[PDB]
Amino acid sequence: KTVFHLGVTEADLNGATLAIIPGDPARVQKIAELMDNPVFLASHREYTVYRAELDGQSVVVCSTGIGGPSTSIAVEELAQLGVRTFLRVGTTGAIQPHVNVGDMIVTTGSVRLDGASLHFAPMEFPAVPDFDVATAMKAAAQESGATVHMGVTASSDTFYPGQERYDTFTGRVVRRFQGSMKEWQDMGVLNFEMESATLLTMCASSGLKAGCVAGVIINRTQKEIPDHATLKETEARSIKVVVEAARKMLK
Amino acid sequence: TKTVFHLGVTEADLNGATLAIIPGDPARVQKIAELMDNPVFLASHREYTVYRAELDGQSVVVCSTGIGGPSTSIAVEELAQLGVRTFLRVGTTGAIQPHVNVGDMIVTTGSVRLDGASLHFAPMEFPAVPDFDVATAMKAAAQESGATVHMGVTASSDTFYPGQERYDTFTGRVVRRFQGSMKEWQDMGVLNFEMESATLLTMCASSGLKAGCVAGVIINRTQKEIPDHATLKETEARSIKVVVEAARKMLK
Amino acid sequence: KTVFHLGVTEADLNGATLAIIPGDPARVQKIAELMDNPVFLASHREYTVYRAELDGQSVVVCSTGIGGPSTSIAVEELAQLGVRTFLRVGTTGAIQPHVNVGDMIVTTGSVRLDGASLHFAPMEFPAVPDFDVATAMKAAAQESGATVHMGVTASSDTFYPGQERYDTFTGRVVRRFQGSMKEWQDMGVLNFEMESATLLTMCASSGLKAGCVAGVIINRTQKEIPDHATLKETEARSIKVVVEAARKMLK
Amino acid sequence: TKTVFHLGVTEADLNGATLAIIPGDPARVQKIAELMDNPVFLASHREYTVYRAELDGQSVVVCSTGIGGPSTSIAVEELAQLGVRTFLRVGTTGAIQPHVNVGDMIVTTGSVRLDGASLHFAPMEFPAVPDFDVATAMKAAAQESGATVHMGVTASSDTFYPGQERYDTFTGRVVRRFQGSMKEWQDMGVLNFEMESATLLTMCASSGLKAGCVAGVIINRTQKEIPDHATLKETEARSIKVVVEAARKMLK
Amino acid sequence: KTVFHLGVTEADLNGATLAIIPGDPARVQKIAELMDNPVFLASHREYTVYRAELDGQSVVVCSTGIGGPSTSIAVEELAQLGVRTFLRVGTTGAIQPHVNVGDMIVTTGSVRLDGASLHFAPMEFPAVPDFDVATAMKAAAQESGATVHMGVTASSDTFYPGQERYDTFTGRVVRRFQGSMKEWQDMGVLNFEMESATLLTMCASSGLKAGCVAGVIINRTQKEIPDHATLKETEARSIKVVVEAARKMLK
Amino acid sequence: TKTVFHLGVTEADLNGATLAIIPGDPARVQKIAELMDNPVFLASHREYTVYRAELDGQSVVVCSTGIGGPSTSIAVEELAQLGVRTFLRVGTTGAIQPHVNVGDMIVTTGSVRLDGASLHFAPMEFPAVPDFDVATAMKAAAQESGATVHMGVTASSDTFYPGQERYDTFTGRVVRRFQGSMKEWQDMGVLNFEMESATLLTMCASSGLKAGCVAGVIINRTQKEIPDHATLKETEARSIKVVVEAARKMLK
Ligand SMILES: O=c1ccn([C@@H]2O[C@H](CO)[C@@H](O)[C@H]2O)c(=O)[nH]1
Ligand SMILES: O=c1ccn([C@@H]2O[C@H](CO)[C@@H](O)[C@H]2O)c(=O)[nH]1
Ligand SMILES: O=c1ccn([C@@H]2O[C@H](CO)[C@@H](O)[C@H]2O)c(=O)[nH]1
Ligand SMILES: O=c1ccn([C@@H]2O[C@H](CO)[C@@H](O)[C@H]2O)c(=O)[nH]1
Ligand SMILES: O=c1ccn([C@@H]2O[C@H](CO)[C@@H](O)[C@H]2O)c(=O)[nH]1
Ligand SMILES: O=c1ccn([C@@H]2O[C@H](CO)[C@@H](O)[C@H]2O)c(=O)[nH]1
Ligand SMILES: [Cl-]
Ligand SMILES: [Cl-]
Ligand SMILES: [Cl-]
Ligand SMILES: [Cl-]
Ligand SMILES: [Cl-]
Ligand SMILES: [Cl-]
Ligand SMILES: [Mg+2]
Ligand code: NA
Ligand code: NA
Ligand code: NA
């Protein structure tokens, strides 16, 4: 009756069938307060859960933590409680020079550099969003005035070697990932993050609608530090966008 | 001024086209071209029949691919060499879901890579996904036409027979990898089987080209394995009308 | 009782149990006319089908198209209609300096750089010809006066990156295939083509006899461009050779 | 003197610590720290709560990891940048063998790599193995506590549900790879499931860092009896006392 | 210069460029004694080495031990000493009902169920014999009066689970190998052994000529136990055949 | 009352032995047995020479394995059929870390699975790790002999030549997979190369058998590729003394 990790029951969600799923627990209240009647439900580990109302309909907001494994738990347990549509909002590192800090990326497919996706579908299966969710996210992102990019995201189980970072304790990257950032760049991949491959694969193979939208907080090719106000505005815009995408999905 | 190696056409032959409609069957090429203005035969060699036509005053090239990723990859490469940047696949397909009926249209949002040629462009982790603008145009064309349209995942196989878990064959054998695969895909929500989309979509998405796929359902695999001939012509006619309208939506 | 792609019936084949399978539909009639009583049966898609008679026995000639996928359909449908022996005749690109334009290659095994072979047997299984077919092809090739090479062929699902060609739209070759031509050269591989891995694997694992013979039309290591007469002679000799190999198989 | 990106601490904040105790749950950090002397809260961000304390006069870090290899890998990397060389994981686990009882303790001698992050450090052939000195210290601490201690292989999964072959789920299905997997691991002698050890052990064993894992058994997948509140409370308390004693044995 | 494992020098081989390579050290002297002037050279570990003369030419006989790893050492060291042609004679278990005890098998390709082959070529590469050696072995085997089968052999790194034996300590076969004997049977594979995949792959990728011939000593589908005389005749036949195959390779 | 297929012995011939010492070379078998009481020759066939002896009143088998995982797997299986449950491998090895000296001993804590036979017992994800008691006994016995002992990861290859990245060979070629591999392993902290531990440890850890490996260093790959039989002799007397003393510790 109460799911194992999230600490909520189906009745606690007041009929919600849509969830907004940021990674950071501290972002949950910030998203919920953009909607009506936000109420804290539970916090356990990296999972902070609020309910709110959007155009009269109940919406969940639930953090996922970093990575596919923790994300997979939250999605499963929300689905046990009746949630069928999942909107991820997150941050990302662009790897294309034409993408600027402050722009928004809607993922059309993920490079599966994770492990949890394989626990739902073999590697051949595409990590792709639900087309209605991606469509709603693009429209919401455009309506906010942001420059919006649609494209492929590389989704890594690590922050460091799987994103080909060398400024580390060992300074090494395993053979698999040596030269990988240039390979993705040349294949037109827009950005790196750590959860979309798991989220999209598990939802596309399980009868759940999912999509991902993110604000760009860094460009791996532009070694300049983005303006502070710009970072804060991007954060605020990203969560405005995801709430407006949720509105479009509720009709 | 030289011709490309397989297709037998020059850049001048394309008369400025930067969009191609790429059916599988050579016989569909003239049919598609004749839905547009000023259709002109360009060349035919092997499985590659090539026409040019005009749509709203803009040149479009129509080029068959043959069956499978290998022959498709050649056509896409050589057309890209001549300046084509947008590729609209139209084909036939077998439905894996019980509710998806003969004559319905499927627009692929991603492909299960049950092919080999896709791996010659990107490792298996890379998603076989369409360009979002092309998929959007295909959906709109299909829906505006009054068709019954499904968006979703397609299983794209290097074989017609074992890789689509057909048993009515010479040996009746399906290798271990493919035993029980149709029900697995069905349970995962996959809509349909075809043979070219994983290669096309992977190649294009990793090469700076815009591609999508739309297909008419010619069989429901929860019923049987071999498509009935009687419904092929009407489904084909619908499919090619849709793809030409999708091309119109992609112009300029 | 008409097979779906080829558009022929068992009765149309007049008892044939052997097929010659070129890639190009335009070559079918050219092979058939080397035999007695050639008759056109059907043309659909890349599949042009003739029957003929060789030493009083019926023989099919059927094109395959380019690649393993289209080849696999033709072989399957012909086997449904009683064909048990398949003789492929094709063109090939040599990658060894000692193999000249105009020589012939009989494949003793194929490097499986395809996908369709995996739909018949896992990768561990060898893509090898039937020993009687390969023996007949060698004998026929030698009897035509050609210089014949027996050895391994690399069989690719692509013409361009899987044969390590860089003169392409993108100019890139995926990691897997970077350096691959030199690797195959050092391993003694003779040539590239695009169908043998599928053909040989599907037949060797399905109770069908198969082999491949090819005339060398280019050498990836030679700057010289072969002349028109040499190429024309090679094309003609290849199809004479495959018909004489068929004669040896029928007794 | 940098602050690492996620953990929010500097090298100076660690007061020379070269050993960290790494529980999964942020709420357990303070409890472990308070078993030692002069615990000091350093930082909390996302799933990473960081304390310092003193053990026999030497500084020790306690830092939570979150659930899964990905978040664990960040914490280990950033601690290593700040001079930590020895990592002692204390966690909870589900036994899969009938002879292992709730309240027993498991010291992992190797992990089945059912994760993804381990592959970001070493190819699959590489063993997910603890440092022998750490495993020795954990065995000794666990046995000295009076617990029944099992040394053996742990299955380390990127999921809680299908990768541990759970069917009481939204879909009720498990992908082919994991169908029948619990029985296969049982027959191979595997003791338990958890979600972080493959990543931790592989990354440390291939990076010059010393690591090990000890866990109290809180459930047994083969027993229908439900353990009572007091047994669970004792097990949790024992686990963290054991890991602190193992840390004492590692101090030089 | 004395090779580390085999304990012989190039001069010890008296110009031999062909080796016969049985598995069992005890067979080496028996094979050598079928030729002229047999001379014991060395014995270390599983490697017993003789030289003899066949039609006036030097031939080495060297045992391999069980498995690809020990075989790979012997082949490498013999190649260092000038050997270019390797004729394996061994024993095998048939898996097809039509293959009887006392028949001979000449492998046309091997299913690579080993590990050492991967140390020479990726899995896509075919484990196939040199065509001349396979031809010589077929001729020698057929001329002896034996019933001879040409076809695919499954070459396993284990005797027990990789050959799907359940009469074992655990009674367990890992998932990969469950159902495998029936799969190979249905694919037309003739037999199991433990060395050919390594031998054939390493030689075919290294410029060395190799082949395998084996006497059938058991059939996994038969319940009758072969009698002592049949087994003795099969052993004797096998080594006579390999020597006659060597004679066909000299000239 | 079965006689096993390759080893040519029955369970009664072993006089109750449940522990085996398993060197590679048949010539070491009698040398090991004579360090124990009442050694008796049992059988010799192919690379398998089998003796029994008594250690502190308990029966012990000594059985050679040959080179490589395949032949080792046969001996272990057949000995287990005859009641053996603990397997102590002694062998030779090449060091890949500069600081390890010829004559040192290495006790494997886990193996890199660069073999094939291990996959016939467990999928690649499964760790090739020793029984903790056996590894502990081998460490203690090695230290007590006065040897310099190293504990760590071993790379276990199905070849002597390319899989150990040796270039002084007939072709001078190493396949892509293994190019750069020695440096890769050295940077990951791997101590040494040998050819049997991956198979032995995986087989046993997945089959309810206790196993470990100790090896004398006969070459350092920082200097050269080819060992020599002379360095073998001294390194070999101490190796076999150590493995017998490890056996004594396992029987106590
Ligand atoms: O270049 C970047 C930018 C952002 N992220 C995000 O950073 C978080 C960890 O801080 C992850 O959850 C991931 O989604 C990256 O992984 N890489
Ligand atoms: O069940 C079906 C129906 C259609 N196709 C399509 O049929 C063509 C061959 O007839 C191929 O191009 C392929 O994409 C299938 O693969 N499967
Ligand atoms: O270097 C060469 C020469 C020929 N082919 C053949 O060329 C055809 C495509 O033109 C394929 O069917 C293939 O068999 C190649 O692929 N590569
Ligand atoms: O049967 C069990 C018991 C415990 N855990 C632990 O449970 C946590 C999630 O609640 C993970 O971090 C994991 O280590 C499991 O995964 N499975
Ligand atoms: O059924 C059989 C018969 C023979 N062999 C051979 O038996 C030897 C081991 O006894 C190996 O070298 C192998 O080639 C098998 O592996 N399986
Ligand atoms: O550099 C070395 C030294 C020793 N060995 C051992 O050498 C034996 C063969 O001589 C094998 O059993 C193997 O374990 C190696 O593999 N590599
Ligand atoms: Cl977030
Ligand atoms: Cl969708
Ligand atoms: Cl079509
Ligand atoms: Cl915890
Ligand atoms: Cl260690
Ligand atoms: Cl033998
Ligand atoms: Mg270490
Ligand atoms: Na997490
Ligand atoms: Na084709
Ligand atoms: Na051996």
UniProtKB/TrEMBL annotation, chains B, D, F:
Class of this enzyme: transferase
Listed GO MF terms: metal ion binding; uridine phosphorylase activity
Positions bound to cytidine 2: H6, Q164, E196
CDD domains: UP_EcUdp-like
Binding site for Mg(2+) 2: N101
Residues at which Mg(2+) 1 binds: H45
Binding site for Mg(2+) 3: Q179
Keywords from the UniProt entry: Cytoplasm, Glycosyltransferase, Metal-binding, Transferase
Entries under Pfam families matching the protein: PNP_UDP_1
Function comment: Catalyzes the reversible phosphorylytic cleavage of uridine to uracil and ribose-1-phosphate.
Family in the record: Belongs to the PNP/UDP phosphorylase family.
Name this protein carries in UniProt: Uridine phosphorylase
Organism, scientific name: Vibrio cholerae
